[PDB]
């Protein structure tokens, strides 16, 4: 169906312990495919998925240079933001950026992204128009002015509409056997008495890709949102994901509860019950 390429940039200052570390990781959907770490012994853009390995040395060299330049730019930027907030040189700070493109099933651009955060709080974001910015505060307004003066939104728009989607489509083709394969969840319901009055029904989804999934409990055909415990979807380490949903039910009322599962890899949504 729909696809994204996203890069996730994290830069972290560490006063008294050298210069800020910069790491960039790149994803197509839920699959990481590259990394760059300024703390590595020899920082290089490195493959993290098998399908990207076929790219020639030109790809790795070009991206490595971009990341090496970005390392210095983020260090310069961390200095600037420290000043924008009148902060001491003693404290550690974090600058994060996420950028990239989304395309539809036809591979056409749905939208682009370029968002930044400072110390875990929204700082500045490129609007969906790819032509204007939203600055969170007067510090970020300084950045906005610099970027407006220097045509940065135009650069982002050109990148997102061009390079980003072109590379995403290329990656999707090279890794089609995995990137364009949805693996359905393997599902089951477990049961454990809590007391004489209650028991937990836990609905499991294992081995699915991508991570997007809907796992719900209904009682008597009505969603049990407030009473359901949903764990965060978690990576298995084999590309796939895991999740469970649990509800506490009165003893003997188990068959009034149904677990519902929606996922892209399923030919049809599932309805499960505890099978004693």
């Amino acid at each position: 169906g729909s696809h994204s390429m996203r890069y996730f940039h994290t830069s972290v200052s560490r006063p008294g312990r050298g210069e800020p570390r910069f790491i960039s990781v790149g994803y197509v959907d839920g699959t990481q495919f590259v990394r760059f770490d300024s703390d590595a012994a020899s920082p290089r853009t490195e493959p993290r998925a098998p399908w990207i390995e076929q790219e020639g040395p030109e790809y790795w060299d070009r991206n490595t240079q971009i990341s090496k330049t970005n390392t210095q730019t983020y260090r310069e930027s961390l200095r600037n933001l420290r000043g924008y907030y009148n902060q001491s040189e003693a404290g550690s700070h974090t600058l994060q950026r996420m950028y990239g493109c989304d395309v539809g099933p036809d591979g056409r651009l749905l939208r682009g992204h370029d968002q930044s955060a400072y110390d875990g709080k929204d700082y500045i974001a490129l609007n969906e128009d790819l032509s204007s910015w939203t600055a969170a505060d007067t510090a970020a307004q300084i950045t906005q002015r610099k970027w407006e003066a220097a045509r940065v939104a135009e650069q982002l728009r050109a990148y997102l509409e061009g390079t980003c989607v072109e590379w995403l489509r290329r990656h999707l083709e090279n890794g089609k056997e995995t990137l364009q394969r949805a693996d359905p969840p393997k599902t089951h319901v477990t049961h454990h008495p809590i007391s004489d009055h209650e028991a937990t029904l836990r609905c499991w989804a294992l081995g699915f890709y991508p991570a997007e999934i809907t796992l719900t409990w209904q009682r008597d055909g009505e969603d049990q949102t407030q009473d359901t415990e949903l764990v965060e979807t978690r990576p298995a380490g084999d590309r796939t994901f895991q999740k469970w949903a649990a509800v506490v039910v009165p003893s003997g009322e188990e068959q009034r509860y149904t677990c519902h599962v929606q996922h892209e890899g399923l030919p049809k949504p599932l309805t499960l019950r505890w099978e004693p």
């Binding site: 890069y7 070009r62 970005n70 730019t73 310069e76 950026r97 650069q155 390079t163």
Partner: peptide, 8 residues
């Protein structure tokens, strides 16, 4: 490819 970003 990634993008070469501008200073904040």
């Amino acid at each position: 490819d990634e993008l070469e970003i501008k200073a904040y």
